[PDB]
Amino acid sequence: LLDKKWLTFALAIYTVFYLWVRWYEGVYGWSAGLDSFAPEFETYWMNFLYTEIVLEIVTASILWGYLWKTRDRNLAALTPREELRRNFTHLVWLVAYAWAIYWGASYFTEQDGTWHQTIVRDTDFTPSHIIEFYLSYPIYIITGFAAFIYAKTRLPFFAKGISLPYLVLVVGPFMILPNVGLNEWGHTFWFMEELFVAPLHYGFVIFGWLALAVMGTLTQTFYSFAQGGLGQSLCE
Amino acid sequence: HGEKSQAAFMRMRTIHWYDLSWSKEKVKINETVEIKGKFHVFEGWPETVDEPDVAFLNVGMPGPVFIRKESYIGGQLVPRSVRLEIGKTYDFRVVLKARRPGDWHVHTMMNVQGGGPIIGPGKWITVEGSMSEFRNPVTTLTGQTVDLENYNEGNTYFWHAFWFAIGVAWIGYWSRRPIFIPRLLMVDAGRADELVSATDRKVAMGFLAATILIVVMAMSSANSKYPITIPLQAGTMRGMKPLELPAPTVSVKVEDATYRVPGRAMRMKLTITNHGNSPIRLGEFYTASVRFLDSDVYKDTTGYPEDLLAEDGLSVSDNSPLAPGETRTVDVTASDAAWEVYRLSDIIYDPDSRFAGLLFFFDATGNRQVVQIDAPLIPSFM
Amino acid sequence: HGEKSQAAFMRMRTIHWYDLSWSKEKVKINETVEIKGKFHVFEGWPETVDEPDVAFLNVGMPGPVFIRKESYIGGQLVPRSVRLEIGKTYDFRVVLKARRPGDWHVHTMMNVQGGGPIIGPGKWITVEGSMSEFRNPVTTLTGQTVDLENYNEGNTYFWHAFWFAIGVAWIGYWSRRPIFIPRLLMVDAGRADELVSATDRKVAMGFLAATILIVVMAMSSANSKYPITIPLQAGTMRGMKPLELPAPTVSVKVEDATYRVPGRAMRMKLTITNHGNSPIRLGEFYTASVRFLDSDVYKDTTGYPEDLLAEDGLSVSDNSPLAPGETRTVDVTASDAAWEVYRLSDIIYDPDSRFAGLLFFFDATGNRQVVQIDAPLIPSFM
Numbered sequence A: 001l002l003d004k005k006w007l008t009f010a011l012a013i014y015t016v017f018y019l020w021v022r023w024y025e026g027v028y029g030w031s032a033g034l035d036s037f038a039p040e041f042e043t044y045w046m047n048f049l050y051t052e053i054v055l056e057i058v059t060a061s062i063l064w065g066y067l068w069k070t071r072d073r074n075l076a077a078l079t080p081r082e083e084l085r086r087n088f089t090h091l092v093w094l095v096a097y098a099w100a101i102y103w104g105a106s107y108f109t110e111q112d113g114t115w116h117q118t119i120v121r122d123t124d125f126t127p128s129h130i131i132e133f134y135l136s137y138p139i140y141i142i143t144g145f146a147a148f149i150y151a152k153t154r155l156p157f158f159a160k161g162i163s164l165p166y167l168v169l170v171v172g173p174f175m176i177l178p179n180v181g182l183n184e185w186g187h188t189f190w191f192m193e194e195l196f197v198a199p200l201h202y203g204f205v206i207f208g209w210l211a212l213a214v215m216g217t218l219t220q221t222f223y224s225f226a227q228g229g230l231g232q233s234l235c236e
Numbered sequence B, C: 001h002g003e004k005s006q007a008a009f010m011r012m013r014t015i016h017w018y019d020l021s022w023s024k025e026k027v028k029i030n031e032t033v034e035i036k037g038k039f040h041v042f043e044g045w046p047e048t049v050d051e052p053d054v055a056f057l058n059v060g061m062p063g064p065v066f067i068r069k070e071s072y073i074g075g076q077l078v079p080r081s082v083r084l085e086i087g088k089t090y091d092f093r094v095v096l097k098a099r100r101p102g103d104w105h106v107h108t109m110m111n112v113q114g115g116g117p118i119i120g121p122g123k124w125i126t127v128e129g130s131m132s133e134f135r136n137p138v139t140t141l142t143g144q145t146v147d148l149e150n151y152n153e154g155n156t157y158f159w160h161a162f163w164f165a166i167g168v169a170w171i172g173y174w175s176r177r178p179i180f181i182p183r184l185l186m187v188d189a190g191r192a193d194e195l196v197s198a199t200d201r202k203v204a205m206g207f208l209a210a211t212i213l214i215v216v217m218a219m220s221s222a223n224s225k226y227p228i229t230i231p232l233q234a235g236t237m238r239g240m241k242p243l244e245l246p247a248p249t250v251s252v253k254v255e256d257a258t259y260r261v262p263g264r265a266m267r268m269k270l271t272i273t274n275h276g277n278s279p280i281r282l283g284e285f286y287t288a289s290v291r292f293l294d295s296d297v298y299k300d301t302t303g304y305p306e307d308l309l310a311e312d313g314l315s316v317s318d319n320s321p322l323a324p325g326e327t328r329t330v331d332v333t334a335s336d337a338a339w340e341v342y343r344l345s346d347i348i349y350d351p352d353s354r355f356a357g358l359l360f361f362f363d364a365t366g367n368r369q370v371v372q373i374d375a376p377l378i379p380s381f382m
């Protein structure tokens, strides 16, 4: 069996959900979403913010708790074939993390750019901010934490210790979410110019760099893949 | 749509927009709508806002639903940032061409280099038609007419696709062979020196030489075509001509100003001294995009936005005609739902509880006088 | 010699020099030459240049071929930086004393704190004699006359040579023994503790004590001699007195201005309104150190530099006398080889294609009027 169709679901769920989110923000961007003090803004974007925050907290708790509770206690008695299957599942988790990272840190971030350069931002919770800071960022954070936990709890290579590159890849992009405090603070106060390259935005930049730890993470996963079932063929 | 969130005192004391007019309220695609009016730069400019040494006359709108055909300060076109003087009154004119159908709230705004957006009154303008009918023709000094909607789009797409294809070809050339794990094992276990061998070096040399040669040839071709080019035209424009307003014949001294918390009314006591030779009457109080009118004295006919217009929102304790030379003190109350809708009541949250505004005084013959008032605004709770 | 490289529009709209005069064209060593004139700070000061809050009246020249004896703005000496006001006209006077023989291109220039050099017209001045004959005497408040060419030179040489000799003595004392490789081997192989032993420590203590004592004694001696000293005198000088020019009786409105690319001519259409009570005629157009003259109206007699002077470079379509109260629109062409020699045609490369200049209008009796014009400058290619 090895690599199964969980990868198709991993791609499709993010693609479909974010396409629907884009449709929603295209429909309610203007017209209930321009005026932050209008009653329709509360029903179409503040309610969205509340619901998405509650659902993200619940989903993160449930997913992480399930992954930690179903952790493999007897990692020693794991066959190489099962280890290969678990390595493929972890690679599917990493693919989902990469897809979520794309959607969060490229699509909706530059969408925040094109929203703020063309409207006068009315609050810290513009529809763009609700979608990007509080939906896509938590979603990719949840996916990254889940992938890290799966590696630690199913892969003997990633067990017996916390991998530094994986921890950086998982936590640095997470630090972008608390960095929103710098975004709002240096915008209301420091810098009223919409300048997307303003130093108030270098918090995203610095912690966006930590995603480069995916390189060490991926060579670690390559070594984990090539533990018992490394071949032969490769180097033979 | 971006105001009602800015600080009430900052909206009150930055820039006062008046004599605003709109040529049309409903337009077709490609039809032009003109916005005219005057703005006065308040003398008590807040220290937190940089002085309007570099300011841009902008339009508040949800993206290019209109295109700014022209914009004027004084009588001259202002496509760049301009320098404004504190205390001066300028007249402006913005010409907009409809591009996208719908109902749009169009604001005239002034962006200041170190203070952010100063949004004036916004008016709903209806656009009907189809976006596909929109044209933005322009004639260059080289004698060609192009449509700015799609000019150079094909060339941009072509060049970007070409370079993306070159990069993808490079990556795929290296990706035909196995990529990650066997190459990693070969590099780790002993010297590799086997995964990069001729003609890989020849292919890379070809890629590098072709890239440089294609860049040079494309630049030369884009220089032979379009032989006449100019850099981007930028730079703040000085010498904006302000309006030479006559000195007002009305002097007003604000003796305390209060507003109820909570409430929708603002109360102030004014000592009005009438100079000149005509009986005056208080007709309007404009504070921040909100016009409180004394309907018995003046009526608005310029189609001011209804949510910003208080037809009878201005009540004067004694608004009888003020004979020349006579001085009297009256209690003026400006009350309207707009005071709470546009969050002018939220000056209680502000770190500077001072207001500014314009009082419009009208005589019998109809000629009007504009006087500016500013004073601390004291909340009242009991 | 540093202009012709600056941006054409920046040379056009910073500072307009006019009424320039030179006392002499050829001088001897120690002889004085005086440069006089007026400069007007343009109202449309470019935003890329900091406002002339801190400005210095300098001389453009290849090193001290002259010494600046005196310099005045208004009527007062300006050895320090000064504050200038935008839109004001100031008169200046620079006194130069010849120091080095040769043919020198002397410019009057204004350095602005945050904008760099603004170079005015330059004139060739011949210096004859020998540099050895040059003297720069000055009398101090302590009652001694010194020559600034060689004053303190001996003392400076002596002290520098003394301290250099002390350092060389230290180095040579340590360099008598073998230096690099044996000492390195001794330090590496085992503890060294042998290459620095008494009386080396005694010699170093002597060097340190002698250095401190000599510094203290020299400072005390240089305080007993020259007991009266003052710090360097610095600081921007405010309150420069501008010229109180009468209000011009001529108003000019520029209706478009064009220049051919390539070409040596600039064309503009002006609407001239003559107020006052005398028939006026356009005699000069000054744009950037270049004077385009209508020879039928005015002739230059102040010895203006020939390469900057267009004697008949100004052609007016109808330069008949303009009766008072009369308004007419004429086509004015300023054409000369200077327009290309001084790269005023390179405004096509500039990111701000706007020009500024001065128009000089002369009546029958000879009294002149100065009016300032500024407008966009549109290139024409076909």
Ligand SMILES: CCCCCCCCCCCC(=O)OC[C@H](COP(=O)(O)OCC[N+](C)(C)C)OC(=O)CCCCCCCCCCC
Pocket: A013, A016, A017, A018, A020, A021, A024, A043, A044, A047, A048, A049, A050, A051, A052, A053, A055, A056, A059, A060, A138, A139, A142
């Ligand atoms: C990592 C964990 C992430 C957790 C957060 C998830 C956020 C989900 C959206 C919040 C909506 C909100 O809050 O708003 C509630 C909205 C407000 O729209 P309405 O006014 O009712 O109009 C009618 C509804 N339309 C405008 C959508 C037609 O209505 C709803 O009930 C519909 C929400 C549907 C969400 C599920 C579909 C997603 C695409 C399919 C692939 C998954």
Ligand SMILES: CCCCCCCCCCCC(=O)OC[C@H](COP(=O)(O)OCC[N+](C)(C)C)OC(=O)CCCCCCCCCCC
Pocket: A053, A056, A134, A135, A138
């Ligand atoms: C991973 C992190 C999850 C955290 C979830 C949030 C828990 C909130 C607890 C209640 C706080 C409260 O009610 O008070 C917060 C007060 C509200 O102030 P107010 O509305 O101005 O006035 C007072 C109004 N009261 C009296 C009704 C409260 O201060 C603030 O303005 C802060 C609000 C911003 C919260 C940002 C959370 C973003 C989470 C993103 C998850 C993906």
Ligand SMILES: CCCCCCCCCCCC(=O)OC[C@H](COP(=O)(O)OCC[N+](C)(C)C)OC(=O)CCCCCCCCCCC
Pocket: A182, A189, A190, A191, A192, A199, A200, A202, A203, B048, B049
């Ligand atoms: C241990 C080390 C930690 C130190 C960090 C503490 C935060 C500093 C707070 C500054 C307050 C101050 O010092 O003054 C506040 C000054 C006062 O200026 P103003 O006159 O109001 O200007 C008016 C201009 N407005 C209207 C736009 C404000 O505003 C500033 O210029 C803010 C400068 C930015 C400093 C924050 C940079 C954070 C770096 C983030 C990159 C990851």
Ligand SMILES: CCCCCCCCCC(=O)OC[C@H](COP(=O)(O)OCC[N+](C)(C)C)OC(=O)CCCCCCCCC
Pocket: A006, A007, A009, A010, A013, A059, A067, A070, A086, A089, A092, A093, A096, A139, A142, A143, A154
């Ligand atoms: C609406 C939310 C639905 C999330 C569903 C989560 C599925 C449960 C997670 C999980 O444990 O594994 C699911 C799949 C297949 O891996 P499994 O083998 O089921 O995982 C345990 C491994 N073990 C069987 C050897 C013990 O592993 C995967 O690759 C699933 C990837 C799902 C993409 C991540 C979605 C997260 C959105 C916030």
Ligand SMILES: CCCCCCCCCC(=O)OC[C@H](COP(=O)(O)OCC[N+](C)(C)C)OC(=O)CCCCCCCCC
Pocket: A060, A061, A062, A064, A065, A068, A149, A152, A162, A171
């Ligand atoms: C918010 C920012 C995160 C800060 C980063 C700190 C975490 C980084 C290191 C890390 O993840 O290790 C914690 C464990 C991995 O196992 P260990 O750290 O070895 O310890 C396991 C026992 N423990 C679950 C109680 C911790 O991983 C887990 O066990 C997590 C799953 C259990 C938590 C589920 C409850 C959370 C619901 C919200």
Ligand SMILES: CCCCCC(=O)OC[C@H](COP(=O)(O)OCC[N+](C)(C)C)OC(=O)CCCCC
Pocket: A019, A022, A023, A024, A026, A027
């Ligand atoms: C790899 C990222 C793909 C992002 C594509 C996207 O944002 O799609 C939204 C956009 C919306 O434009 P349109 O297709 O005209 O449909 C408009 C519907 N709304 C306004 C809700 C977006 O176009 C599509 O939906 C095309 C489907 C692409 C599938 C990968």
Ligand SMILES: CCCCCC(=O)OC[C@H](COP(=O)(O)OCC[N+](C)(C)C)OC(=O)CCCCC
Pocket: A190, A191, A192, A193, A199, B050, B113, B114, B115
């Ligand atoms: C890594 C490079 C960081 C350079 C910081 C920078 O560009 O700051 C520009 C800003 C100059 O402000 P300015 O660009 O004039 O802002 C104009 C808009 N306002 C006045 C509203 C802020 O300077 C500061 O306020 C100090 C920045 C500290 C960085 C750790």
Ligand SMILES: CCCCCCCCCC
Pocket: none
């Ligand atoms: C207004 C001048 C701002 C200068 C900022 C310097 C930033 C340097 C970062 C090391």
Ligand SMILES: CCCCCCCCCC
Pocket: B212, B216
């Ligand atoms: C090393 C490659 C240098 C290429 C220079 C090309 C110059 C062309 C002038 C138009």
Ligand SMILES: CCCCCCCCCC
Pocket: C212, C216
């Ligand atoms: C440790 C050497 C300090 C020297 C001080 C000398 C003071 C002299 C006063 C004129």
Ligand SMILES: [Cu+2]
Pocket: B001, B002, B105, B106, B107, B122
């Ligand atoms: Cu609006």
Ligand SMILES: [Cu+2]
Pocket: B015, B016, B040, B041, B042, B043, B372
């Ligand atoms: Cu005002």
Ligand SMILES: [Cu+2]
Pocket: C001, C002, C105, C106, C107, C122
């Ligand atoms: Cu020179």
Ligand SMILES: [Cu+2]
Pocket: C015, C016, C040, C041, C042, C043, C372
């Ligand atoms: Cu001038």
